[PDB]
Structure formats: C-alpha cells, structure tokens
Amino acid sequence: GPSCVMDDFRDPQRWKECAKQGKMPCYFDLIEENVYLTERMQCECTPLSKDERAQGEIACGEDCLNRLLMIECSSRCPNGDYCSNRRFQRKQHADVEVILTEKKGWGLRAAKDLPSNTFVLEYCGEVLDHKEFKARVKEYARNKNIHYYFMALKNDEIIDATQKGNCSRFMNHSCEPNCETQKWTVNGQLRVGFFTTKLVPSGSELTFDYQFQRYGKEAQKCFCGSANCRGYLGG
Ligand SMILES: C[S@@+](CC[C@H](N)C(=O)[O-])C[C@H]1O[C@@H](n2cnc3c(N)ncnc32)[C@H](O)[C@@H]1O
Ligand SMILES: Cc1cccc2cc(C(=O)N[C@H]3CC[C@H](NC(=O)CCN)CC3)[nH]c12
Ligand SMILES: [Zn+2]
Numbered sequence: 001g002p003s004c005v006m007d008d009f010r011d012p013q014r015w016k017e018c019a020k021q022g023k024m025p026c027y028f029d030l031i032e033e034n035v036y037l038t039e040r041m042q043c044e045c046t047p048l049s050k051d052e053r054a055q056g057e058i059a060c061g062e063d064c065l066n067r068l069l070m071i072e073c074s075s076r077c078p079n080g081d082y083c084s085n086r087r088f089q090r091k092q093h094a095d096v097e098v099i100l101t102e103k104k105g106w107g108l109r110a111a112k113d114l115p116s117n118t119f120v121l122e123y124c125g126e127v128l129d130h131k132e133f134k135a136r137v138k139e140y141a142r143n144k145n146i147h148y149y150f151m152a153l154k155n156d157e158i159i160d161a162t163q164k165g166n167c168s169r170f171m172n173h174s175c176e177p178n179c180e181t182q183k184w185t186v187n188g189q190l191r192v193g194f195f196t197t198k199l200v201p202s203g204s205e206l207t208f209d210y211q212f213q214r215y216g217k218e219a220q221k222c223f224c225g226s227a228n229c230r231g232y233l234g235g
C-alpha cells in the first residue's frame, strides 16, 4: 500500500489533501504531550568525563537508579546534557513510517533495523477519568466508530488518542508482538511509551499485545496472522 513519514503530519492542509486521496490516515489533532480534561530527587550516577563521553560510553545507562525505577532524569541530572535517560522528554523516537495494512487500517513499520528494548514512541492523548471514559465509549459506539484508541495509564486514568494524539496511535495489536508498553515517570507524572521487545528488521510492522480488559463476549476480530492468534482484540 501507500506509506508516509512522521514529518508528513506536520503540514495540516497537505495532510488533509493526502487524506482525500487515501495516501495518509484521516485527520486528527497532533499533540506532543498528554492533555488532561481533569486538571491535575536526582539519581546517583557519577558524572562522566568529557573523555568518557568521547569514547562512546553511556551516561545514566543500565545501573542508573532513576532508570531502574523507570523514572526519567531531569535537567539537573549529574550527567546534564549527556544523560541517555530523558528519551520521552527529548522525543528520541525510533525511525518508523505509517503504512496501510490489508485489514487493520493503518499501521506502523520500522524504517531501519531497531535493537531490543529500543524506545519507539510515546502514546500521547487526552487523559480521562472513569466517567469521561464511559461517556466516550458510548459516544463512540453511537457514532459507529471502527477504530478505538483507548490505553489504560493508571487507576482512573485512560488515554484516548481518538481525536488528539501522535503517530503512536497507529500501532496495531498482535497476539505475537514485537513491542510492549512501558509506563515511565516524567516530572512526577506517569506516561506510556512503546518499546521493542526484540530486534525488528527494516520494513516489519510494529505490534504490541493490547490487553485492555474486554467488557462483553463481543469483540473485534484479530487479523494478526500469528500461529497463536487468540482470535479477538483485548485481554
Ligand atoms: C489504535 S488503533 C490502531 C490504528 C488503526 N489501524 C487505524 O487505522 O487507525 C486500534 C484499532 O486498529 C484496529 N486493529 C488493530 N490491531 C488489529 C488487529 N490485529 N486486527 C484487526 N484490527 C486491528 C482495530 O479496529 C482497533 O480498534
Ligand atoms: C491502542 C490500541 C491498539 C490496538 C488495539 C486497540 C483497541 C483499543 C480500544 O480502545 N478498544 C476498545 C474497543 C471498544 C471497547 N468497548 C467496550 O468494551 C464496550 C462495548 N463493547 C472498549 C475497548 N485501543 C487499541
Ligand atoms: Zn543516572
């Protein structure tokens, strides 16, 4: 099918044009941070020498205490500019494209090879309390929407990327996936991002195991094509 790049989403009227020809997904409002309907210490890594920075060595890598608790550092981190643990904030996203699938709608694929436990994208959207969430479920059912964009963030917080979000919203489900969600604390506030669970060759679709609690017996069928396909979306 047709494909497109994350920069294509920055030109609104051209996008809408590409959408008229079916060369891009339908329009949504692009945002770079979660938006709320309901109004809401440093680590101990030793500073790296300028020599160690030049050698290729990692600042706040795997032993960093902020990182081990999936907390990103701030500006006041000991390693300052060198800190590798500010990925959400610096928007250090993987190189991925938005493509048209056979039966799932649009999707995400890797433009380059991507290592294991590599950051893909933040799942951004409108954060909802339980009440707003239920309002929208019903509103969406009554508009006969086909695609749904809900992601559980925490107790009484669900991200809805139906109207406002970013390209994370195109990652499809798979019963045998190559990414997972991770919840990270940034400035005392929780966020969700997608991360590879294995190596993902260039061209391959990126998928995760969506486990949002299924309500009815009734569900969306799964066209993931795996050997182990559970048949439907949801947990
Ligand atoms: C967040 S969206 C993913 C983006 C969607 N493909 C689009 O075109 O906007 C989730 C929706 O994609 C579709 N979807 C995702 N994974 C799927 C799968 N494995 N089989 C069938 N539909 C899928 C479902 O309609 C679901 O409600
Ligand atoms: C981010 C992402 C990636 C891949 C798949 C999904 C599905 C969703 C999603 O929001 N699914 C919803 C469906 C409609 C349900 N409706 C009821 O349970 C009540 C009446 N059937 C709620 C869950 N989000 C996704
Ligand atoms: Zn650190």
Ligand SMILES: [Zn+2]
Pocket: 043, 059, 060, 064, 066, 073, 074, 077, 078, 079, 083, 084, 085
């Ligand atoms: Zn740091």
Ligand SMILES: [Zn+2]
Pocket: 174, 175, 176, 222, 223, 224, 225, 226, 228, 229, 230, 231, 232
């Ligand atoms: Zn499946």
